[PDB]
Design a protein around this nucleic acid. Structure first.
Lengths: 1033, 98
RNA sequence: GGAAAUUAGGUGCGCUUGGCGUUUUAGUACUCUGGAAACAGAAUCUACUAAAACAAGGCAAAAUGCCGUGUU
DNA sequence: CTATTCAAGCCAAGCGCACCTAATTTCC
DNA sequence: TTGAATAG
């Protein structure tokens, strides 16, 4: 049977709707569901990888200084360095003798904390904040007559501390101090120059971005040549050739000849430049002026500027011509013609200047050319700037067509046309199904990439089950992801400090659900320069934050006609202006008697904002100054036909992949895409309800609507192959037919597929280290910290003290400080944070009790937390530690259900238990058997099944998806529901229960079975193996 | 019912004219994007509603019709376009409408 | 829709660093006891400084040494 | 077991290439 | 959102 397939491709979901071509009945519908492939996951991986490298290399730096000190008998294994203050030793060493132990302590402290090297040229005015640039500048002015160690020791003596945000210095300042220290100590200790060079080397050296990591690294590379060539792209017309370097001589000559061949000259002779005039323009203007002007071109062929058209133009309007960069850079050093007129040599120089990244490597490789360059010229060439990036063509393509650029007037695309050279198309021949690998080339965002891979697998499963469709119709979601989302919660403004300290307090107070609207009104506020666009009255930022519901985001063209929900259709205006506007365009509204400004004033203010840098969009301007009557049906169908294409890059790439696939293998499938808002547009006119927290089915519903959309646009075109109101009534009639609408609303066999995750070596455990204590009963308790003690909204300390003051360690040790704290709690008990009120009223922080009032400020307070069960003991890393030191939250890999004497039990496998062997992973058998013994699982027990994240489990007849082991000791597992989240399930019932499903696997468990789905949601029960799997590849 | 001239704007292609048609319940606003000079200069009121207009915008009738929100003084359609221009010319200059 | 160029902006992969942060140990200050005082003892709370560990762990063996939270 | 409670490493600084968007000129 | 401890 013949069918139409609709797809709704989202961030977390792929909805599919399969409906009949003739009957228009729904054959099947469902949703494939998966985690968002957010970039923060990889960001975190590569961040942690980078943090491991820093830590390893700083340790290796310390050990190499330590070996230098051993080699010169300045350190032994018997050396005692404990009581030496290295600040005092560093200061005193700058002018007096240090003992061997003091000298070693000073050098080792310098080596551990050695400063930045790359901020050092940049200096800023102080804005008094957490920037390292500003702190380097403040410290550079504080060091004008002081060494680093001198300033640090003054901070230690006056303020009582050295470490922290203040402690950021330049490496070159540590080097100055280290040289003065070594200059003094060489008079008193037996060192040589090799000591000084080796130590200063260890102190200042680090790797460069182009050197990368040491030998053996999968992330590394053997030389700069390999590094750059693997990064750089390939030619458009010769895809096995690497691109030319951007500023190669022949590439800029190619650009210049393209610029000249696109000129049209108003004169009695030829409209186009002939060869010898191009020769004279290259040799007399482009090889004489660094930035050529139109006046110099016109003077060289003896016309005036207005007789010349066709030139590229700046945004200012000034004419733009190719600059001959290497020619003029090498020319200012050297005008010898055996250098400057060797095009091949200039290309080689430009390649070397672009690939290699330092002056010394430039000089070595330029010297290795064995040219007629002098050494003094090579040293000046090596310091040229700007040699970065690639041209989009290879030199093969450029040098292939350069002669025809000289002696014809054709530009590059005409010449590649005449030569029958076409950009590369990827072969798709011996493929039984759509491969996911062609996604890897063209896509950029990881979220869209996962969605596309899942969309292709869904299409392949649909063609495999139902056969080939006649039409595939696709809608991609829009209007943000939840990634750039968070980047507006981080970026927050350009004018950061004084404003963003108070939006940060407003946004954090505000719940995460109803707070994206406010940041979008801020975005619109900044692009409208704080002006309501319908009254041209100022909107105060502060009033927008305290009273956001006094300012509305209005759709420029109404949703009833536009179906555009981007920033190009939305503006920020006052509530009463959006109310008086109503269902109108700005033209209709401002021309009435309801407006406070005229349309002409509005149009001038919009057209002046239409210009400039960071300008308002062209489609925004076209919406704002729409003058047609949007109530007329021809205009409405113009808005539909114009804005249904989905012009976006990812969509075009997916359509080209699919159309190429069906074209190559002789499959007649028409594939079309519609834009985002359009289906919601159709539901707004088919009376589909606003409340759609009724589960994941709304994704499959949208896919069903997308499939019937195809019918509407075929029956329109047979209508346009053709007494006005009757015709409008036939377009509007077949647009509005509710026959299929009730057929979708009554559908009730939706299927759901949740993607299962079985990857090993995910996060093993939480980073935070915890100390512990023993009580009188011998229980081991975790010690927790209260910080942010003076934050205004922090009531944690108050609730703890009023409920259970004995939990504070201070309560038992130092009860006089506790009394001070209790007094503040009494005095400001009605406030949310009493220490904040204390600080505000008194200007002081709480100090530790002392009789002379010289007690230290208290900034975090320890209390006795929960009993220690599940943990990783790391105490061995901390020698002579009086208590256990732990990490917590043992992340679970899977649980294995057993049936033992009529009682269901399970073994948890932790990510910690899954060990990487040669080319695979192995469940730890010793940990697995200790788990079986802990759970009293006998050898007579039957293995039932293994359950991973999002495996389906049926417990006591009810089917759930697995989250993970909640509690191994108490046999608890967390699950969620399959057609809906449990949160939404309870909110539909108006139920206040906590939205987590915990199940206890024990004697009240009557039945456990494992199910599974294919990618389309078809359920099947799994026959599990006899044994739990040990190896994962 | 009373017809008011509420808003005008001199364009190159004639003038733009807004007319409010008001009874005790409703305000029906008619936007005439381009009425020619031959009608405006000679007060030919009776020809105005022959010209193309946008769909009328219906809203609740206002309590008074003295001036619009831009500041122009509202004139009854029977009084003519020249009365509207004469009363409002200077403010129309201020608001780029003349 | 596709090709090239100029400018501004954005995203991603990967590389190189900094200062923090958590925790232990030691010293010092703080509290308590003895004492005229150096000092000694107790307490391990609060802070500062140093040294060390920081996904469990796996390589390697003087080395600007390497790998371990991503995707499929 | 049900309902609750607790808390979960961070921000600043620089570089290579790839890709995308927006504006402009020519052609296919 | 999730490991997981706790009061009842």
């Amino acid at each position: 049977r013949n069918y139409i397939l609709g797809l709704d491709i989202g961030i977390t979901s792929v909805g599919y709707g399969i409906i009949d071509y003739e009957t228009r009945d729904v054959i099947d519908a469902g949703v494939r569901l998966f985690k968002e492939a957010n970039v923060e996951n990889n960001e975190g991986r590569r961040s942690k990888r980078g943090a491991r490298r820093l830590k390893r290399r700083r340790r290796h730096r310390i050990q190499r200084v330590k070996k230098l000190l051993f080699d010169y008998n300045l350190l032994t294994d018997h050396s005692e360095l404990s009581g030496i203050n290295p600040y005092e030793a560093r200061v005193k060493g700058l002018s007096q003798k240090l003992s061997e132990e003091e000298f070693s302590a000073a050098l080792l402290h310098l080596a551990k904390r050695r400063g930045v090297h790359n901020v050092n040229e940049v200096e800023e005015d102080t804005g008094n904040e957490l920037s390292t640039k500003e702190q380097i500048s403040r410290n550079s002015k504080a060091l004008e007559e002081k060494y680093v160690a001198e300033l640090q020791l003054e901070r230690l003596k006056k303020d009582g501390e050295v470490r922290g945000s203040i402690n950021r210095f330049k490496t070159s300042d540590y080097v100055k101090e280290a040289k003065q220290l070594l200059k003094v100590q060489k008079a008193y200790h037996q060192l040589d120059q090799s000591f000084i060079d080796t130590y200063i080397d260890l102190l200042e050296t680090r790797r460069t971005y182009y050197e990368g990591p040491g030998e053996g690294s999968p992330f590394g590379w053997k030389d700069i040549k390999e590094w750059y060539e693997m990064l750089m792209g390939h030619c458009t017309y010769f895809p096995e050739e690497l691109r030319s370097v951007k500023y190669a001589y022949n590439a800029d000559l190619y650009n210049a000849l393209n610029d000249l061949n696109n000129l049209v000259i108003t004169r009695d002779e030829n409209e186009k430049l002939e060869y010898y005039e191009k020769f004279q323009i290259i040799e007399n203007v482009f090889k004489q002026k660094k930035k050529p002007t139109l006046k110099q071109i016109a003077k060289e062929i003896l016309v005036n500027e207005e007789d010349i058209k066709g030139y590229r133009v700046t945004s200012t309007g000034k004419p733009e011509f190719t600059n001959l960069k290497v020619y003029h850079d090498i020319k200012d050093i050297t005008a010898r013609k055996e250098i400057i007129e060797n095009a091949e040599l200039l290309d080689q120089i430009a390649k070397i200047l672009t690939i290699y990244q330092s002056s010394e490597d430039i000089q070595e490789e330029l010297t290795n050319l064995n040219s007629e360059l002098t050494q003094e010229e090579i040293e000046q060439i090596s310091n040229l700037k700007g040699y970065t990036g690639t041209h989009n063509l290879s030199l093969k393509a450029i040098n292939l067509i350069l002669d025809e650029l000289w002696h014809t007037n054709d530009n590059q695309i005409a010449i590649f046309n005449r030569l029958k050279l076409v950009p590369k198309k990827v072969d798709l021949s011996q493929q039984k199904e759509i491969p996911t690998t062609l996604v890897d080339d063209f896509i950029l965002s990881p979220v869209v990439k996962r969605s596309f891979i899942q969309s292709i697998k869904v299409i392949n499963a649909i063609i495999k089950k139902y056969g080939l469709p006649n039409d595939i119709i696709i809608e991609l979601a829009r209007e943000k992801n939840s990634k750039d989302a968070q980047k507006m919660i981080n970026e927050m403004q350009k004018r950061n400090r004084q404003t963003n300290e108070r939006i940060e307090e407003i946004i954090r107070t505000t719940g995460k659900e109803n707070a994206k609207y406010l940041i979008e009104k801020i975005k619109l506020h900044d692009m409208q320069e704080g002006k309501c666009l319908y009254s041209l009255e100022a909107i105060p930022l502060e009033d927008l934050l305290n009273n956001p519901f006094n300012y509305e985001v209005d759709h420029i063209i109404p949703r009833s006609v536009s179906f555009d929900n981007s920033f190009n259709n939305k503006v920020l205006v006052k509530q009463e202006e959006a109310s008086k506007k109503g269902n109108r365009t700005p033209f209709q509204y401002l021309s009435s008697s309801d407006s406070k400004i005229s349309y002409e004033t509005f149009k001038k203010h919009i057209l002046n904002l239409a210009k400039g840098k960071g300008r308002i969009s062209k489609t925004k301007k076209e919406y704002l100054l729409e003058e047609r009557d949007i109530n007329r049906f021809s205009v409405q169908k113009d808005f539909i036909n114009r804005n249904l294409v989905d012009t976006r890059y990812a969509t075009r790439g997916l359509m080209n992949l699919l159309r190429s696939y069906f074209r190559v293998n002789n499959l007649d499938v028409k594939v079309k895409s519609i834009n985002g808002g359009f289906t919601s547009f159709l539901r707004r006119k088919w009376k589909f309800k606003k409340e759609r927290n009724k589960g994941y089915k709304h994704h499959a519903e949208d896919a069903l609507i997308i499939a019937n959309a195809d019918f509407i646009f075929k029956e329109w075109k047979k209508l346009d192959k053709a007494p006005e109101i009757e015709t409008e009534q036939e377009y509007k009639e077949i647009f509005i037919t509710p026959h299929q609408i009730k057929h979708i609303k009554d559908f009730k066999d939706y299927k759901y597929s949740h993607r299962v995750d079985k990857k090993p070596n995910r996060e093993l455990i939480n980073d935070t280290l915890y100390s512990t204590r023993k009580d009188d009963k011998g229980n081991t308790l975790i010690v927790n910290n209260l910080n942010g003690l003076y934050d205004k909204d922090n009531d944690k300390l108050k609730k703890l003290i009023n409920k259970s003051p004995e939990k504070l360690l201070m309560y038992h040790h130092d009860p006089q400080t506790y009394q001070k704290l209790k007094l503040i709690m009494e005095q400001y008990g009605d406030e949310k944070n009493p220490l904040y009120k204390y600080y505000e009223e008194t200007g002081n922080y709480l100090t530790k009790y002392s009789k002379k009032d010289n007690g230290p400020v208290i900034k975090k307070i320890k209390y006795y937390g929960n009993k220690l069960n599940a943990h990783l003991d790391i105490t061995d890393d901390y020698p002579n530690s009086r208590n256990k030191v732990v990490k917590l939250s043992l992340k679970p890999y899977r649980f294995d259900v057993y049936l033992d004497n009529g009682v269901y039990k399970f073994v948890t496998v932790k990510n910690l238990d899954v060990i990487k062997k040669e080319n695979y992973y192995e469940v730890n058998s010793k940990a697995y058997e200790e788990a079986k013994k802990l759970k009293k699982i006998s050898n007579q027990a039957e293995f039932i099944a293994s359950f991973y994240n999002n495996d389906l489990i049926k417990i006591n007849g009810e089917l759930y998806r697995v989250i993970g082991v909640n509690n191994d000791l108490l046999n608890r597992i967390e699950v969620n529901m399959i057609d809906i989240t449990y949160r939404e399930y309870l909110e539909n019932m108006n139920d206040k229960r906590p939205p987590r499903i915990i199940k206890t696997i024990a004697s009240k468990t009557q039945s456990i079975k494992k199910y599974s789905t294919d990618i389309l949601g078809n359920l099947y029960e799994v026959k599990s193996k006899k044994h739990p799997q040990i190896i994962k590849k | 019912s009373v017809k008011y001239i509420s808003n005008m704007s001199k364009q190159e292609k004639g003038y733009r004219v807004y007319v409010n048609v008001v009874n005790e319940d409703t305000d029906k606003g008619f936007l005439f994007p381009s009425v020619p000079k031959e009608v405006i200069e000679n007060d030919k009121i009776d020809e105005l509603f022959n010209f193309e207009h946008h769909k009328p915008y219906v809203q609740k009738a206002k309590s008074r019709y003295d001036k619009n929100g831009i500041g122009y003084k509202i004139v009854q359609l029977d009084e003519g376009f020249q009365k509207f221009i004469e009363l409002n010319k200077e403010k129309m200059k201020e608001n780029l409408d003349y």
